[PDB]
Amino acid sequence: GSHMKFVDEASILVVAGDGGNGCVSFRREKYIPKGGPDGGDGGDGGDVWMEADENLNTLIDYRFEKSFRAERGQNGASRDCTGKRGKDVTIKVPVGTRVIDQGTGETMGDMTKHGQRLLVAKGGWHGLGNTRFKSTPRQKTNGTPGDKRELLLELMLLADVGMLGMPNAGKSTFIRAVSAAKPKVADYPFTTLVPSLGVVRMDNEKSFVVADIPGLIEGAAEGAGLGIRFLKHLERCRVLLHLIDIDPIDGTDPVENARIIISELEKYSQDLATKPRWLVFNKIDLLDKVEAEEKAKAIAEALGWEDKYYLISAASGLGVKDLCWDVMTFIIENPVV
Ligand SMILES: Nc1nc2c(ncn2[C@@H]2O[C@H](COP(=O)(O)OP(=O)(O)O)[C@@H](O)[C@H]2O)c(=O)[nH]1
Ligand SMILES: [Mg+2]
């Protein structure tokens, strides 16, 4: 049966801090009688931690920043003054992220709940100052090196945003235009004719997954099991975008097309049909600006659609970034609960 999965992947480098070094010193004070060793120990190096964050949706930021370095521990000083510990680094990933050690290929951990932490690079240990060698010792040790590790990060992706619409509305054009990356498909016998998913990156820590719903529900290569598995994680889907070709040359009338799409949606699933749904009119580049607005207002009027709708050209980019920021806003404002 149906096993297709979409997997987000990133490879990053994590480097913990080295230990600070030990110090060699002695108290040589005029009436305070002895030689007295007094060199302090170094500080331990800083650690690298991964932390699960339920507000992140994808691993997209780790395609761009790929290297993380915690701080070296401080050297020891006189008066048995032990060096300050090096500062830690925490790297945030979505809930569901599996963390693999790419050197050894072993799974280090799975980030299954909010605020959960995983140590991925242990900092070096402090050097010892001469005070530790006592029986007037002139020896000290250096701090040990911080772990250096390449991590493979893997995350099964579920749709945050669904596209709806007729064939040739511009759904895959839209998806490809907004996508910073295409996730890899796993457990699917074929390699062609995959439904369209994309990861949208708006800015740091601000991303979402967009999917073409008809590709998923039509059991095109995987059969009817795929749409059921889509429905299984529907709670991750915050909003649907009903994409409408504003002037179909195919002669078709946008109002009736819109009605067929709605009706098919309601038949398939009542939860899917009650999701927030926004009208988005596409291919406005073909028309003059004011004419597009008329045509759109008229279609909205005829559907009894009272909400705000959008006008865009998925081809040229007109209105697309504004739409994506409104989707990002909605997402940030409606976390899954
Ligand atoms: N002129 C124009 N053509 C578009 C726009 N969006 C999509 N198209 C074209 O319409 C056709 C259908 O788009 P596609 O993304 O394949 O539709 P889908 O079937 O909904 O995935 C393609 O030839 C696109 O290049 C647009 O904003 N303007
Ligand atoms: Mg297509």
Whichever domain contains 132, its CATH number is 2.70.210.12
Of 184, 187, 207, nearest to 197 by C-alpha is 184
Task: Tell me: do 118 and 138 sit in the same domain.
Answer: yes
Last residue of a domain, one of 131, 157, 183: 157
Q: Whose CA is nearest to atom 1 of ligand 1?
A: 283
List Cβ neighbours of 303 (8 Å cut-off, separation of 6 or more): 255, 258, 259, 279
Task: Tell me: do 163 and 145 sit in the same domain.
Answer: no
Task: Tell me: do 86 and 114 sit in the same domain.
Answer: yes
Task: Tell me: do 212 and 123 sit in the same domain.
Answer: no
The secondary structure element, H or E, covering residue 176 is helix 171-178
Last residue of a domain, one of 124, 141, 157: 157
Last residue of a domain, one of 108, 133, 157: 157
What is the structure's resolution, reported in angstroms to one decimal?
1.9
Task: Tell me: do 227 and 324 sit in the same domain.
Answer: yes
- The number of beta carbons lying within 10 Å of the beta carbon of residue 3 is 12
Experimental method: X-ray
CATH of the domain at 249: 3.40.50.300
Task: Tell me: do 277 and 322 sit in the same domain.
Answer: yes
Task: Tell me: do 112 and 171 sit in the same domain.
Answer: no
And the tokens for 133? 């060698």
- Helix 320-333 × helix 171-178 angle, to 10°: 80
DSSP 62: G
Give residue 106's domain range. Answer: 1-157
E-state strands within the chain: 5-15, 48-52, 67-69, 89-93, 97-101, 107-111, 117-121, 148-156, 161-164, 184-186, 197-203, 206-212, 239-245, 277-282, 310-311
The secondary structure element, H or E, covering residue 328 is helix 320-333
Angle at 175 between CA 173 and CA 263, to 5 degrees: 90
Which of 163, 164, 166, 168 has most ligand 1 atoms within 8 Å of its beta carbon, as the pocket-test mutant?
A: 168
And the tokens for 120? 């991925």
304 backbone φψ class: left, alpha, beta (φ>0; ψ -120 to 50): left
Q: How far apart are the C-alpha atoms of 204 and 206, rounded to whole Å? A: 5
Which of 163, 166, 168, 173 has most ligand 1 atoms within 8 Å of its beta carbon, as the pocket-test mutant?
A: 173
Task: Tell me: do 61 and 200 sit in the same domain.
Answer: no
